[PDB]
Amino acid sequence: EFSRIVRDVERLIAVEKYSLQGVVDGDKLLVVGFSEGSVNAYLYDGGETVKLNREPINSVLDPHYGVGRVILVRDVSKGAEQHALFKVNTSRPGEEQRLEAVKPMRILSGVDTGEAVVFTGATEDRVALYALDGGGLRELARLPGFGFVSDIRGDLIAGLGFFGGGRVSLFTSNLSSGGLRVFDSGEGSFSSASISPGMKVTAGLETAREARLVTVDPRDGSVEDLELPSKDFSSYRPTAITWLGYLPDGRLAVVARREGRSAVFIDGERVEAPQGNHGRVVLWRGKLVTSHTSLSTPPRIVSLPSGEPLLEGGLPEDLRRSIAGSRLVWVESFDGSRVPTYVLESGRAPTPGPTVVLVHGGPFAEDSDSWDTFAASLAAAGFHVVMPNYRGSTGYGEEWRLKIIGDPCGGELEDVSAAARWARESGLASELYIMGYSYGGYMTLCALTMKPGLFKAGVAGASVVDWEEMYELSDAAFRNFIEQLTGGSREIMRSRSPINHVDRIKEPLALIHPQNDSRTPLKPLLRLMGELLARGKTFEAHIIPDAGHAINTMEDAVKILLPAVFFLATQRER
Ligand SMILES: CCCCCCCCO[C@@H]1O[C@H](CO)[C@@H](O)[C@H](O)[C@H]1O
Numbered sequence: 001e002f003s004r005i006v007r008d009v010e011r012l013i014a015v016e017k018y019s020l021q022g023v024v025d026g027d028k029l030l031v032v033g034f035s036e037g038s039v040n041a042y043l044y045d046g047g048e049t050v051k052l053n054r055e056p057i058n059s060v061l062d063p064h065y066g067v068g069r070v071i072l073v074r075d076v077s078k079g080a081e082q083h084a085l086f087k088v089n090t091s092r093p094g095e096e097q098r099l100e101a102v103k104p105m106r107i108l109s110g111v112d113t114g115e116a117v118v119f120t121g122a123t124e125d126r127v128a129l130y131a132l133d134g135g136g137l138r139e140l141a142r143l144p145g146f147g148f149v150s151d152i153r154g155d156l157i158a159g160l161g162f163f164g165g166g167r168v169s170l171f172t173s174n175l176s177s178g179g180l181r182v183f184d185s186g187e188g189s190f191s192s193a194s195i196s197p198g199m200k201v202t203a204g205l206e207t208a209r210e211a212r213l214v215t216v217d218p219r220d221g222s223v224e225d226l227e228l229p230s231k232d233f234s235s236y237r238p239t240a241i242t243w244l245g246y247l248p249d250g251r252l253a254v255v256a257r258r259e260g261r262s263a264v265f266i267d268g269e270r271v272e273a274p275q276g277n278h279g280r281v282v283l284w285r286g287k288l289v290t291s292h293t294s295l296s297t298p299p300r301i302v303s304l305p306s307g308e309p310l311l312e313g314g315l316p317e318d319l320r321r322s323i324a325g326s327r328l329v330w331v332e333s334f335d336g337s338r339v340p341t342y343v344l345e346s347g348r349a350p351t352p353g354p355t356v357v358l359v360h361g362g363p364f365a366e367d368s369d370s371w372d373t374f375a376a377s378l379a380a381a382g383f384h385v386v387m388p389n390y391r392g393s394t395g396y397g398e399e400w401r402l403k404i405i406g407d408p409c410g411g412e413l414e415d416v417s418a419a420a421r422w423a424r425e426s427g428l429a430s431e432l433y434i435m436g437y438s439y440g441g442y443m444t445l446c447a448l449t450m451k452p453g454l455f456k457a458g459v460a461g462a463s464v465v466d467w468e469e470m471y472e473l474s475d476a477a478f479r480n481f482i483e484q485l486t487g488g489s490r491e492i493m494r495s496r497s498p499i500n501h502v503d504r505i506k507e508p509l510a511l512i513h514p515q516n517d518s519r520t521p522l523k524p525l526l527r528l529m530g531e532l533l534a535r536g537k538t539f540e541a542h543i544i545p546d547a548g549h550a551i552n553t554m555e556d557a558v559k560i561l562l563p564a565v566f567f568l569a570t571q572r573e574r
Pocket residue numbers: 013017018019032033034039299373374550551552553557558560561
C-alpha cells in the first residue's frame with residue numbers, strides 16, 4: 001500500500017549500478033551500467049559516459065585490452081534468454097551489426113580477441129564451446145555441462161566447467177583446431193584462470209581449507225603451486241579466489257576473499273581498496289581500477305589505492321540511514337556446523353522487531369558484504385534482514401559448498417531454519433518471515449511445506465516447485481545442473497519438490513514469477529497455484545509480462561520487488 005514503500009523501492013532500484021568489463025577503443029574503460037532505466041554498455045574516459053548499444057542488453061563479452069569493438073549479448077526472446085550477439089565498432093557508438101552466423105541460444109560466457117569471438121552456449125541438446133572468426137562459426141567442443149570461457153592467449157583457450165558432482169574443472173581448447181582437455185583436481189575446484197606468458201594456466205584452486213594459486217601445464221596436466229614476488233597474498237590466507245588476470249604490463253592481479261570481504265593483490269602485494277567486495281582489476285592509463293560494492297554501497301567503479309570513484313550512483317543519505325547496522329554472525333546449525341550469516345538491522349524497526357530471513361539464490365552463491373537491493377528495500381521498509389550462507393554457498397571452502405550435492409531441501413534448509421531460530425533467540429526478531437528468489441524461492445517453498453509454523457509468511461520469487469517438470473522443460477545446461485544437484489535420483493527429484501507436500505502449507509504465501517523464465521519455468525508454478533486453490537490454501541501471485549530470470553529494466557525490477565514488500569508490510573499489520 002504505502003506510497004512511501006513505493007518511492008523507496010523505486011529510488012533504491014533507480015540508483016545507478018556499474019560493473020567493470022575491461023579496456024577498449026585504445027584506452028577507454030568499458031563498463032556495463034544499470035542506468036537510465038535499464039542495462040546498457042558504456043565507454044568511460046574521464047568525463048562523460050558514452051552509450052554503445054541501442055536497446056537494452058544483458059551483458060558484453062570480455063574484450064581483449066584495447067580492441068576497437070564490443071560484442072553485446074542481448075536476449076531476443078522477451079526474457080527466455082535465447083540471446084543474439086551484436087557488435088559495435090567503438091568508433092561508431094550506437095551502430096549495431098548482428099552476428100547472424102550465431103543462431104539464438106543461451107549464451108553463457110565469451111571473450112573477444114578482436115579477430116575472433118569465443119563463447120560457450122547452451123541449446124536444447126548440448127552445451128558447447130564456439131569460435132566465430134573471419135571464416136565463420138565453428139563448434140570447438142561439446143561440454144558436459146555449464147562451462148565458461150576464462151581467457152585466450154595466442155591459440156590457447158582456457159575456461160572453467162561444472163562438469164560433475166558440483167566440482168569445477170579447468171578446460172582448454174585450441175582456437176584453430178578445437179578439441180577439449182579437462183583438468184580436474186582431487187583437492188577441490190578451480191575458480192578462476194588466466195593464461196601466462198609461458199602459455200600455462202594460472203588458476204585459483206579452492207580446497208576444503210584455504211584457496212591457493214597454482215600453475216597447470218596444459219600439455220601434461222601437471223600442477224604446481226605458484227609463488228609470487230610479494231608474500232602479502234599468501235599470508236592473507238584467502239578462502240576463495242574471485243578473479244585473477246594478467247595486466248598489460250605483465251603483472252598478475254588477484255582478487256581473493258574471506259568471510260564476505262575481498263582484497264586486491266598485484267604480484268602478491270596488497271593494494272589498499274574500499275572495504276567490501278571487488279571485481280576485476282584493470283590497468284587504465286597506467287592506473288589501477290576496479291569495481292567496488294558493500295552492503296551500503298551500490299556497485300561502483302573506483303581507482304586504487306585512493307578509492308576515489310570514477311563512476312558511482314549515489315545512495316541518498318536517507319536510504320543509507322535506514323540501514324542502522326550490519327553484522328556477521330555464526331549461526332549454530334542442527335549438526336553443529338556454523339552458518340556464516342550477514343545481518344542488517346533496520347533503523348526503521350524496533351528491537352526485537354519484524355525480521356526477514358532473505359535466502360540467496362544459486363545455490364552456488366553467497367551473501368557477502370556486497371550491495372543487495374532486496375535487503376536494502378526491506379530495511380527501508382522496516383524489517384531487519386538475516387542472510388545465511390547455508391551449505392552449498394560459495395565463499396567458505398569446497399567442503400561447505402559441496403554438502404548440498406544430492407541433498408536439496410535437506411541440510412541447507414536446516415541452516416535456513418537455524419538462522420530463523422538464531423534471529424529469535426538472539427533478541428533481534430519479534431516475528432519472522434522468509435523471502436527468496438531463484439534457489440531462494442525454492443527455499444521459501446521448502447520452508448513452508450516442511451517447516452510449517454516456523455515463519456509467519458513466505459515470499460517465493462522465480463522459484464523451483466518441482467524438479468521433475470522443470471527438468472523436462474530444461475535445456476542441456478539446466479538438465480545437467482539438476483542431475484548434479486539431485487545426484488541423478490528420481491526419488492530425490494520427487495521427494496524434495498514442494499509440489500508434493502502442498503497439504504502441509506499453513507502460512508500465507510506470495511508467488512512472484514516472470515512469465516518467460518527459462519531457468520525456473522512458470523508452468524510448474526501454475527500447477528502449484530492449482531493445488532493451493534483446490535486445497536483451500538491462502539495465497540497471492542504476481543506474474544510479470546515479457547520478462548524472464550535476468551531482469552534488465554528498472555521497471556521490471558519494480559514489478560518483481562514491489563509486490564514482495566507490499567505483501568510483507570500487509571502481513572506485518574497481522
Ligand atoms: C529488485 C532487484 C532487481 C535486480 C535486477 C538487476 C538487473 C541488472 O543487474 C545489475 O547490473 C549492474 C550493471 O552491471 C550491476 O552492477 C549490478 O550489481 C546488477 O544487479
